[PDB]
Write a protein that binds this ligand. Structure first.
Ligand SMILES: N#Cc1ccc(-c2ccc(OCC(=O)O)cc2CN2CCN(c3ccccn3)CC2)cc1
Ligand SMILES: N#Cc1ccc(-c2ccc(OCC(=O)O)cc2CN2CCN(c3ccccn3)CC2)cc1
Lengths: 306, 306
C-alpha cells in the first residue's frame, strides 16, 4: 500500500470520466504554438483530464475559503478573496517542465472560477553570473545554492499573503543571465504556476513548497532525458548559439558529431549530477507524478490519495 | 502583509460565529475526564470554534475525495473512502501540546462526518534508552536523531496510504522508556492527530509533515515555558519521582530551592536548546499557531489565509 493511486497510460485512457468540455479547435490552434513539439492527443487525453482534476481542488479551496469566512462572520482581518492557489512543477533540466506548465496555464484559465493563471519560473531567482563567479558557482547553475533562496521565499510568501502585487526578476535564456532591472509583476492571480528545478526542495528553514497547494513532478528515465538534452543542444546551434552576442557562440560551429560529445559532457558534469543529488529526491513530495516515455508521451500517472 | 490572519483573545471571543455552538451535558463531563485542571471556558470559547474551523477543512477534503472519484468514474485502483485526515501538533516540551491534542481529539469526534479521531505521539518512536546510550544520545532525548525517523515515516505513510491497520510503539512517561512489546494500533481513523516535538521538522528525505492535511504549533514566550517546566518538575516530586522504583526518585526529596536549580539546569541544557535549534524554526510551517499567555490561556491565533 502506497500514498498514491497509479494509472498507466492504458488505464488512464480506459476511463470513463465526466465532461465532454472538449477543445474548441480555435483553442487547439493556440495550443500548437507553445513550442517545442506539442502533441495534441497528449492534450486531449492527459492534460485536459489533469486540468479538470486540478480545477476540482482549486474550486474546493475557493468554497472552503468562503465557508470559513462565513463561519468567522467576515471579520475585518479576513481577506476578501481566496489568496492565489499556487502550483509547483519540478523535474530535471530538459524534461519539459516549461511546456507542461504553459499547457496547464492555458487549460486551467478556461474555467470562470479562476481565469487568471500566472506562470513564473525560478530561473529569475538565480544569482546573476557575476555573483555566481564570485561564489565559485558558475559550474553549478541550477543547484540549490545557485538561487537566491531568500528572495524567492519573499516572492512566494508575498503572493500567498494575498498582496496586491509581487515582483520577480527575469532571467534571459539567450544571454544566460539575469536581466538588469527587468521584473515580472504578479497581481493576485487566481492560480500561480511556479516552474523550476528547485521548487520541491527541502530546507531547514521554511521552504517555498510549504506554500504550494498542488505540485507536479515531471519524470522520465535518465537515459531518455540525456537524449532530449543532446538533441536540444544540437538544435540550439541555429538559434541561441548562432547569435554572436551569446557567451556560447563558439558551440555554434561544432559539427553534429562534436556537439554530441560536448552536450554529453555538460550533461554528465552539471545536469545529471544536479538531477540525481537534488531533484530526484523531491519526486515523492509531489501531489502528482507524470512519467514520460522516450518520445515524450506520458506512460504513467501517480496521484496522491485524497 | 503576511500569509496568516491574526486574531487575539478578545477578537476571537467577541466574534459573530455563524452557529450557536454550545457544548452539551455530558460534553463538559467527558472533558473533565482529561481534566488535569483543563479550563472548560477556554475549551468552549477557543478550542470549539477552532474545532469547527478544522471540521470545515475535513469536510471539504471529504467532498473533494467524492468529486474526484466521481470524475474518474470510480476506478478499481481508487480507494473507496478518503484516507485519514492527519493533523500535526508541535511545540516545545511542556508547552501543553498533549493537552491541546487531547482536547481537539475530543471536540473533533463530535461531528458525524468523522466521529473516529485517533491520537498518536511521536514519543513512541524514540529509540529505547539502551539504543540511546549506545549512540551517545541519552542527553539529547527529543532531539531529531533520538527518534527512529525511518519507522515513524513508515507509520504515517501507512496510515496516509489507507491501510486497515498500522502499529506504533508505546512510550512510558513514568519510566522514561519504550515499553517492550506494547503497540498502539491505528485502524483508518477519519482523523489522526500526531503530536510531538519533531512533527513539523524538515529533512532531505520525504518528511512526515508532507503527509499532514493540517498542523498546529503551540507557542509561548521561552521564559514562560521555562516557568512551567520548573513548576512541573517540582510537582513531579509528588507523582513520577515519588515512586522509589523510578530512576529519578532521589529528586522527590529535593526541596524547592534545590529542585528549582535541578529543573532549571535540565531545561538550560536539554529542552531549551532543543527548542531554539529544532522546534522554534518549524513554527512558521504550521497552518495554525496558538500562542499562550504566562497563565496558560491562549492570547493569539495565527491562521494561514485560505
Ligand atoms: N562553468 C560552467 C559552465 C559552462 C557552460 C555551461 C553550459 C553551456 C552551454 C549549455 O547549453 C545547453 C543548454 O543550455 O541546455 C549549457 C550549459 C550548462 N547549463 C547552463 C544552464 N543551467 C541552468 C539551470 C537552471 C536554470 C537555468 N540554467 C544548467 C546548466 C554550463 C556551465
Ligand atoms: N543524559 C541525560 C538525561 C538525564 C535525565 C534527564 C531528565 C531527567 C528528569 C526529567 O524530569 C522532568 C520532566 O520529565 O519534565 C527530565 C529529564 C530530561 N528530559 C527527559 C525527557 N525528554 C523527553 C523528550 C521527548 C519525549 C520524552 N522525553 C526531554 C529531556 C534528561 C537527560
Amino acid at each position: 500500500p502506497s500514498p498514491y493511486v497509479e494509472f498507466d497510460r492504458r488505464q488512464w485512457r480506459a476511463l470513463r470520466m465526466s465532461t465532454p468540455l472538449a477543445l474548441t479547435e480555435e483553442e487547439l490552434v493556440g495550443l500548437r504554438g507553445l513550442g517545442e513539439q506539442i502533441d495534441l492527443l497528449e492534450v486531449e487525453e492527459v492534460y485536459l483530464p489533469l486540468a479538470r482534476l486540478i480545477h476540482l481542488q482549486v474550486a474546493a479551496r475557493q468554497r472552503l475559503f468562503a465557508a470559513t469566512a462565513e463561519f468567522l462572520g467576515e471579520p475585518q482581518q479576513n481577506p476578501d478573496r481566496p489568496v492565489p492557489f499556487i502550483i509547483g512543477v519540478a523535474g530535471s533540466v530538459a524534461v519539459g517542465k516549461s511546456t507542461t506548465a504553459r499547457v496547464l496555464q492555458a487549460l486551467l484559465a478556461r474555467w470562470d472560477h479562476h481565469p487568471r493563471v500566472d506562470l513564473v519560473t525560478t530561473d529569475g531567482f538565480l544569482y546573476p553570473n557575476a555573483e555566481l563567479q564570485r561564489r565559485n558557482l558558475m559550474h553549478r547553475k541550477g543547484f540549490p545554492e545557485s538561487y537566491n533562496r531568500r528572495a524567492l521565499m519573499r516572492f512566494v510568501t508575498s503572493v500567498k499573503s494575498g498582496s496586491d502585487y509581487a515582483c520577480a526578476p527575469v532571467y534571459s535564456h539567450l544571454h544566460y543571465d539575469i536581466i538588469p532591472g527587468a521584473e515580472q509583476v504578479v497581481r493576485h492571480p487566481d492560480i500561480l504556476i511556479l516552474e523550476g528545478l528547485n521548487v520541491l526542495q527541502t530546507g531547514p528553514t521554511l521552504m517555498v513548497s510549504d506554500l504550494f497547494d498542488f505540485s507536479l513532478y515531471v519524470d522520465a528515465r535518465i537515459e531518455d532525458i540525456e537524449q532530449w538534452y543532446v538533441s536540444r543542444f544540437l538544435a540550439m546551434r541555429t538559434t541561441a548559439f548562432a547569435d554572436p552576442e551569446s557567451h556560447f557562440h563558439h558551440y555554434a560551429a561544432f559539427s553534429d558529431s562534436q556537439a554530441v560529445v560536448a552536450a554529453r559532457e555538460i550533461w554528465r558534469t552539471i545536469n545529471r549530477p544536479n538531477l540525481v543529488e537534488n531533484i530526484l529526491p523531491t519526486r515523492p513530495r509531489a501531489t502528482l507524478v507524470l512519467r514520460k516515455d522516450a518520445d515524450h508521451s506520458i506512460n504513467r500517472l501517480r496521484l496522491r490519495k485524497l
